[PDB]
Amino acid sequence: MNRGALIKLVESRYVRTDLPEFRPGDTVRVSYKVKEGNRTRIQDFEGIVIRIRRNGFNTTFTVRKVSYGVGVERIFPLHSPLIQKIDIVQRGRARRAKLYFIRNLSDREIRRKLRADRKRIDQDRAAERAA
Amino acid sequence: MRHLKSGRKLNRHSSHRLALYRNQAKSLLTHGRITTTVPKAKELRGFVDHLIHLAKRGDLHARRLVLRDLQDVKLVRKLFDEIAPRYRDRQGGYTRVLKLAERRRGDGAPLALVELVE
C-alpha cells in the first residue's frame, strides 16, 4: 500500500481547481458563504495575503486587512467549499514567503515594501486576451 | 524520542559535524578508500555521493556547489575530470562501506573501510 496515495484518494473528492493562483503580497477578495440565523449570505473579505501554508488539499492561506481601525486576519482553506470565488484585486511583490512583518508597518510603509508586481500584472492582462 | 529523525550527531556539535563530514569527503575523494569507525563511515556514504553525483552533472554551478564543501580546486578537478566520469551510467551508489574484522586497540572501536566504486 501507498499510504500517501490513499489519502490523496480520499481528499480527491474535495479538491477544487476553479480558484485563481495568487501569492503573498497579492491583494485578494474572498467571497465567503456565511450563516447568520437565518439567511446565509456571501460576505466578501478583501485584504493582503500574508501567508500561504502548503500541504496539498490542506493548504491554507491568510488574509490581513484593516477594518475600522482594528486589523483583521482571517484564515481560509484553499479548498473550502465555503469560498465562492477569489478575485485578484492586485498583484504585490514580496521578497519572502511569510509576510508577518506588515503587522507592525504604517499604511505608508507597507505600500513601500509591497510595490505593484508589475511583471505578474502585465501577465494577467496577457490572459483575458481570450478567444 | 527521536521518532523519524535522519542523521547522527556523532557526539559533535553542528559546526564540527559538518567539518567532520567534509574532511572525510576530502580524504575519501583523495585516496579512494579510507578507514574509519563504522558509524562515521555509514554517514560518509551519502555525503560523498551527492558531491560525486554533482560532479557528474559537470556544470559550473555544480562545481561551485561541490566546491563549497571540498574547498580544493585541484581536488574538485580530479573529482570532475577523473572521478565523475566512471559513473556516467551508474545511477547512484557511488560508494560502498565494508566492515573490518578487527576492533581498534585503545578503545575497541569497530572499524570499516569506505571506498569509491568502479
Binding site: 499510504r3 490513499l6 489519502i7 484518494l9 473528492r13 474535495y14 458563504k33 473550502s80 | 524520542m1 521518532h3
Partner: protein, 204 residues
C-alpha cells in the same frame, strides 16, 4: 458485535455540511476468517481473522499448516474479534455504514522512559526562586515513619506508550469499499502504518 483488522493510514479532514471533519483513514478489509472459536470447542465465541497477505516463503510449517486447514492463503497478522460470528468467510469494511459509531484499539506511540511530567502531568518544580536541580522532579513520594513505605502504583517515571489503547465511540464518516477504506472521525492510537482493530462501539 462485528469487528475488523486494519492499518492506520493517516489524517486529513473532509468537508461535510460546511464543516471540517477531522478524520483518520484506516485500510480495513479484507480479512479472511481463519478460525472460529466455539463454546463446545473453545469455551467461548469469536472469529480469528487474518489480515495482510504474506510471502509463503516466510511462513513456517506450524503456521502454514494452520492456514492450510482453514483453506486460506497466508496472512501477516492473526487477531480474534470477540463474540462475533460473520456469516461469510471474509470480513470487509462493508460491515460498517457511515454514521455508525465505533471503538478503535491500536498501540499508542512509545515515549520511552518518560519523566513524571510527560507521563503523569506532574507540576514539576519552580524554575527560579531557588529551585535546586528539581525542575521536573516528582517532589515527595512518601510520608514518614508511618507508613514508612511507598504505595503500589505510586505515579512515577517509567516507560510510557507503545501500549494498547482503545479509543471509543468514534463516528464512521464514510466507507469506501472500492478501496477498503474506513474514515473514522477524530483520532486513533498509533503511528500511521500501525495496526488497528475497529469494533462496533459499546457506548449506547
Amino acid at each position: 458485535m462485528k469487528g475488523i483488522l486494519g492499518v492506520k493510514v493517516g489524517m486529513t479532514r473532509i468537508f461535510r455540511d460546511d464543516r471540517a471533519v477531522p478524520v483518520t483513514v484506516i485500510l480495513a478489509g479484507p480479512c479472511p476468517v481463519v478460525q472460529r472459536r466455539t463454546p463446545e470447542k473453545d469455551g467461548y465465541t469469536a472469529v480469528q481473522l487474518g489480515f495482510l497477505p504474506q510471502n509463503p516463503k516466510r511462513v513456517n510449517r506450524p503456521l502454514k499448516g494452520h492456514f492450510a486447514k482453514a483453506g486460506v492463503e497466508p496472512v501477516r497478522i492473526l487477531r480474534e474479534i470477540r463474540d462475533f460470528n460473520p456469516e461469510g468467510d471474509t470480513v470487509t469494511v462493508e460491515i460498517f455504514k457511515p454514521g455508525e459509531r465505533v471503538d478503535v484499539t491500536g498501540t499508542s506511540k512509545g515515549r520511552g522512559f518518560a519523566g513524571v511530567m510527560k507521563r503523569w502531568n506532574f507540576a514539576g518544580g519552580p524554575d527560579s526562586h531557588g529551585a535546586h536541580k528539581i525542575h521536573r522532579h516528582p517532589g515527595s513520594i512518601g510520608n514518614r515513619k508511618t507508613p514508612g513505605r511507598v504505595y503500589k502504583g505510586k505515579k512515577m517515571a517509567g516507560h510510557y506508550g507503545a501500549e494498547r489503547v482503545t479509543v471509543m465511540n468514534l463516528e464512521v464518516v464514510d466507507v469506501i469499499p472500492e478501496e477498503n477504506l474506513l474514515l473514522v472521525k477524530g483520532a486513533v492510537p498509533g503511528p500511521n502504518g500501525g495496526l488497528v482493530i475497529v469494533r462496533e462501539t459499546k457506548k449506547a
